[PDB]
Design a protein around this ligand. Structure first.
Ligand SMILES: *C(=N)[C@H](C[C@@H]1CCNC1=O)NC(=O)[C@@H]1[C@@H]2[C@H](CN1C(=O)[C@@H](NC(=O)C(F)(F)F)C(C)(C)C)C2(C)C
Ligand SMILES: *C(=N)[C@H](C[C@@H]1CCNC1=O)NC(=O)[C@@H]1[C@@H]2[C@H](CN1C(=O)[C@@H](NC(=O)C(F)(F)F)C(C)(C)C)C2(C)C
Lengths: 306, 306
């Protein structure tokens, strides 16, 4: 019993974190094989960040202008390249601690762990979801850029995010490990709108199934609904539309509890239309949308990694 | 900006996890130097756990009856000892991955990270607090016993908890690394009461200061209070009494925000007496008590570890 926001063990990623300095700007880098990946704004001064021309700024930088430090030991930079919004520094030493890894571009609604770092050193780990508006609700201060988001499948680390900036609503923006931003964000210090933040409906339903498995089922009502009638209600509350693909993904949890997805949709509708009346679900007074159906199955089954 | 429940990076602890089997029971062990620490109920069958006499049960066990596995390699057990509710297995190999460590017995209200494990392998990491009633609100399934709680001060791991059992209210119980239970719990499968769960007042105040630092300050009112008048209200809501020691611990946060602790107490009083009226604080619809004043300072300052 019990249900908590759980991050993946971070040991494999800790061994990949390095500190990257260019001039007076220092941030975090990810050292995998003989390449160090970092946000390209490491080459910017505070002034440059207002309206940077990254191509012109980078042209005045040579290999020796990038200091890469792993603990107390300096890595020698033998090449550099800009790939979208990430800078790749080729070093003369392959990271001996490189785990089995892949680079992935996740979809909105999917979750991942973040190892927040400062000056190349680990500070902490937490679980995030890519919001439907391509922002994340993290905790990042100045110097946290370069910190990465990842998932782990047994012994393989799938890197999916690199932190770049904070938007005016307090939420965060970043890229995949090919340097392409999630969302319409740009790496420039200018006013940027995130857009309406919608609730990840399939995740809320997954979390309601987690509540049932844990014995918390006061919210289960005597009604059922249809996909179209549920979506008419969901769209009023800025909930993402539910599709037959989401219904299928919920299949294991539906079969475990004996509760049809459309019956759970009717209980969700009543929670949206009536609130929780001072009550809680899994110790929460709000409907939680940062647990995917996979996260629920994993935590309820005790899936382990190498 | 942003405020999340953050766990310590788990790499140093991952390198210490082993699998311990005795007969048909398998659980997690912690391998530090040439000793493996694990819950003594590893020697029990399902039947034994109803009313065990650990001393008689252990007397029928020899070194060769304990299989200790680190990954795929078997460790040789050359000695065994029962210390309160933990079993210590002396092995012939010192763990090469042993970090700098200490064993500590934490106080109620203090927080720590848990690396939940199954069969000696890491599953995930989350942050917990030792409740005033000496229970934790974790997420543990059968086989998670032996998983540990720890804090990290730069490069030193302070182990403070080892998981043993789940109480009927869904909360968990365990020991320090000397095998002494936190609370009045015993390692026997019998009805056990946790006692009233009170709110960690100094932690709620710390989290209110975190909200202010992050720009979330709708709740700040025009009132102040006294320690005795606040405590008369707090005790009605099952809040722990606030002392001058707690006021002093809040000092850095009080000085950073310019908000006196007694002024913050008056705003807390109004939140307890009026609720939050459908509003949230740091994305939460309840008053959060699992962030100590130290956790707030650390997350707001970006403290890092080796
Ligand atoms: C990199 N270490 C920081 C991390 C920021 C600092 C506060 N919390 C974070 O996540 N990244 C930046 O400073 C980036 C950087 C220039 C400006 N910047 C911002 O995050 C700014 N944001 C924006 O201008 C906005 F709103 F468009 F997102 C800031 C105002 C400082 C929060 C570049 C190159 C994008
Ligand atoms: C060890 N792997 C498990 C972990 C439990 C299983 C469910 N979630 C957990 O945290 N520990 C146990 O099975 C311990 C073990 C015997 C009984 N037990 C319990 O946790 C039981 N609890 C109690 O009897 C109670 F209420 F007193 F706490 C159980 C009913 C199985 C939840 C021993 C030796 C204490």
């Amino acid at each position: 019993s019990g249900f908590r926001k759980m991050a993946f063990p971070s040991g494999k990623v800790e061994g990949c974190m390095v500190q990257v300095t260019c001039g007076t700007t220092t941030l975090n880098g990810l050292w995998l094989d003989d390449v160090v990946y970092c946000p390209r704004h490491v080459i910017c001064t505070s002034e440059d960040m207002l309206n940077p021309n990254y191509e012109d700024l980078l042209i005045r930088k040579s290999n020796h202008n990038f200091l890469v430090q792993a603990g107390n030991v300096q890595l020698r930079v033998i090449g550099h390249s800009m790939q979208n919004c990430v800078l790749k520094l080729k070093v003369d030493t392959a990271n001996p601690k490189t785990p089995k890894y892949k680079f992935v571009r996740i979809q909105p609604g999917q979750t991942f762990s973040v190892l927040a770092c400062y000056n190349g050193s680990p500070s902490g780990v937490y679980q995030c979801a890519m919001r439907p508006n391509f922002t994340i609700k993290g905790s990042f201060l100045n110097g946290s850029c370069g910190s990465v988001g990842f998932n782990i499948d047994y012994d393989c680390v799938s890197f999916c995010y690199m932190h770049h900036m904070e938007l005016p609503t307090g939420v965060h923006a970043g890229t995949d490990l090919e340097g392409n931003f999630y969302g319409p964000f740009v790496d420039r210090q200018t006013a940027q709108a995130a857009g309406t933040d919608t609730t990840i409906t399939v995740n809320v339903l997954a979390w309601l199934y987690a509540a049932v498995i844990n014995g918390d089922r006061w919210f289960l009502n005597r009604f059922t609904t249809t996909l179209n009638d549920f979506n008419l209600v969901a769209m009023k509350y800025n909930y993402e539309p539910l599709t037959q693909d989401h219904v299928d993904i919920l299949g294991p949890l539906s079969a475990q509890t004996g509760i049809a997805v459309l019956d759970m949709c009717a209980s969700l509708k009543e929670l949206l239309q009536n609130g929780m009346n001072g009550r809680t679900i899994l110790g929460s007074a709000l409907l939680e949308d940062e647990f995917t159906p996979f996260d629920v199955v994993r935590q309820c089954s005790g899936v382990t990694f190498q």
